[PDB]
Write an enzyme that holds these catalytic residues in place. Structure first.
Site, mmCIF file in Angstrom:
data_model
loop_
_atom_site.group_PDB
_atom_site.id
_atom_site.type_symbol
_atom_site.label_atom_id
_atom_site.label_comp_id
_atom_site.label_asym_id
_atom_site.label_seq_id
_atom_site.Cartn_x
_atom_site.Cartn_y
_atom_site.Cartn_z
ATOM 1 N N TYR B 129 10.521 38.230 -4.415
ATOM 2 C CA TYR B 129 10.107 39.583 -4.265
ATOM 3 C C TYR B 129 9.200 39.923 -5.443
ATOM 4 C CZ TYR B 129 13.362 40.017 -0.279
ATOM 5 O OH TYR B 129 13.974 39.863 0.975
ATOM 6 N N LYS B 179 23.159 30.861 -1.346
ATOM 7 C CA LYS B 179 23.059 30.048 -0.106
ATOM 8 C C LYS B 179 22.802 28.642 -0.559
ATOM 9 C CE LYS B 179 23.589 29.437 4.176
ATOM 10 N NZ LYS B 179 24.072 30.299 5.312
#
Lengths: 337, 337
Positions: B129, B179
């Site tokens: 981001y 993850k």
């Protein structure tokens, strides 16, 4: 139908898959089934995870039905990366189809029983879920790790096209979910591709939501979704959130689809192998049976798929809180066919 | 002593900040307050988004209280990137602190009003981001778009260290959410860092969850979380989910913290500028006031923060369903200090 490759897999995979196969046999008689021990059994027996030639055999079938893969006896990631991810890449399962419907008989964790019936179409073969990146200076204060998400018009358009098709067949609403404000290149590609493919579906209303906002709306207003399309990473999150609001991944089915039909698509219950209850006849085969409906629908067996859908719904609607063995659930669903 | 920079900002920001400041002054009298005119207002008047000169002025303060920033009248992303993101980067707000507590009196979109009291500690200054990537062959079927997430031991350890400190001060439970099975490089870095920092926190029980599984648990079992630590991208999703299950973003506060204290940390309600209700005195200042409690606690004013917490809780427990004006909530809370 015609030719079915069955990968019942590990843990509870075989017992749920047996029921799913019974249901498939009862709605489409005369299916040639080839069963593969892939996963832990094959891995212990031969050292093989997804032998090049196995992919080749799998291509010989119209579709694949998978139960679950994973067993604590196999070393970390060996089956997950080497069997499941690999199958998905090798068979070009670019579409990950994840329906999220809240059925009578299933409790949502959400307040107040909203109608929820949406489907998530997740891109399945690109983004950062592919392993692209690297690290340097590992295990030091200087470590830098990079993860690269590769997104392509090729990959995105296919999945977007498929989601619009599905929206057209459903309630003609498509929500793109991404994070365009901050993933400007991947998001720009997703947005533009949705817009561009959208030109061919003027009957489909399109919305866009950031993934964080979508997450909120899945909890506060899940009825606002019809078809959601999203990428591999965000889709991984939001399909699990979808399953949860629809009563859990234990009642969720998944299609891993090659929309070009060059490779057989694969269908499976979302749930894992739950090795702790393996072979106890406890596991609920509902999701595996639901995945059979998906498989049938993909193959054009729409009436057969409808039958399974109805029989599943029937079972969920009256099961109440009865303890039902795996074969009891299969019996109940079979009886409603 | 205490020097405070106030960026009331746009829309409802002024109104809610006024109440936040009323509550500030009631608990800590000696506060040097400097107002800063940043956001849509400044952009229209001067063309300036965040002059370097202004950042330098903001650095002279002990903390920054922000209302809300942004307006439809400003081009997409211009304030978000050039003001908000830039402030985050320049002031090294590497910890984004996002408490999620379901207060007596607040309805959760979840069934059965579950106990929810956790904090998310989200990495603030690295990950994808950041703007890193690019595209080739845009607008063609050959488009390829990449997004790159850079993760570093430097950044990760700071966030992780802070999370462990928070878990120690709380219920001594930390969940790392990532993850790691597929973001192997960033994941391994986060796993190893949590493990390594954890060595100094044997009092803290550490759990790991994949983000997909964590989002399921946020809705089915939110009581399982005490402190969550995660990266920027995942934290962006889970903090929003967390606010939702805690009754909405309208009741969420945020800390943007430089845990080294070199720069002032910044504290704000999570909600946007909500320009449609601006100046109307409708806006609920509760979140702005909760942000002041976070500010105060960050500044070492633990007693003053506790008083604000109690006053906010009292307000939420007794407000009921009657429509309160902004200064009404403000006074309701101030009186309960």
């Amino acid at each position: 139908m015609s030719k079915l490759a069955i990968i019942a897999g590990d843990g509870i995979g075989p017992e749920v898959t047996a029921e799913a196969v019974k249901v498939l046999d009862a709605v489409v008689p005369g299916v040639q089934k080839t069963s593969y021990d892939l996963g832990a059994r094959r891995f212990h027996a031969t050292g093989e995870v997804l032998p090049d030639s196995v992919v080749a055999e799998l291509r010989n079938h119209d579709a694949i039905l998978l139960g679950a893969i994973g067993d604590p006896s196999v070393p970390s990631g060996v089956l997950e990366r080497g069997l499941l991810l690999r199958l998905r890449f090798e068979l070009d399962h670019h579409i990950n189809l994840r329906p999220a419907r809240l059925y009578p008989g299933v409790a949502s964790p959400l307040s107040g029983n909203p109608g929820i019936d949406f489907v998530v179409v997740r891109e399945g073969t690109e983004g950062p879920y592919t392993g692209n990146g690297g690290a340097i200076r590992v295990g030091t204060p200087n470590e830098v790790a990079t993860e690269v998400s590769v997104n392509t018009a090729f990959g995105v358009r296919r999945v977007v096209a498929d989601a619009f098709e599905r929206a057209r067949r459903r309630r003609k609403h498509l929500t793109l979910v991404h994070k365009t404000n901050v993933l400007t290149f991947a998001g720009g590609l997703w947005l533009r591709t949705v817009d561009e493919v959208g030109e061919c579906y003027p009957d489909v209303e399109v919305a866009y939501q950031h993934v964080d906002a979508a997450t909120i709306h899945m909890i506060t207003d899940p009825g606002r979704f019809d078809v959601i399309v999203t990428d591999n990473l965000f889709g991984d999150i939001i399909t699990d959130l979808a399953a949860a609001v629809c009563g859990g991944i234990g009642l969720a089915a998944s299609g891993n689809i090659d929309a070009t039909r060059a490779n057989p698509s694969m269908f499976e219950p979302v749930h894992g192998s739950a090795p702790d209850i393996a072979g106890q006849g406890i596991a609920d085969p509902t999701a595996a049976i639901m995945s059979v409906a998906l498989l049938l629908s993909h193959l054009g067996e729409h009436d057969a798929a409808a039958r399974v859908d109805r029989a599943v719904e029937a079972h969920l609607a009256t099961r109440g809180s009865e303890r039902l063995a795996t074969s009891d659930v299969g019996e109940r669903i079979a009886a409603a066919l």
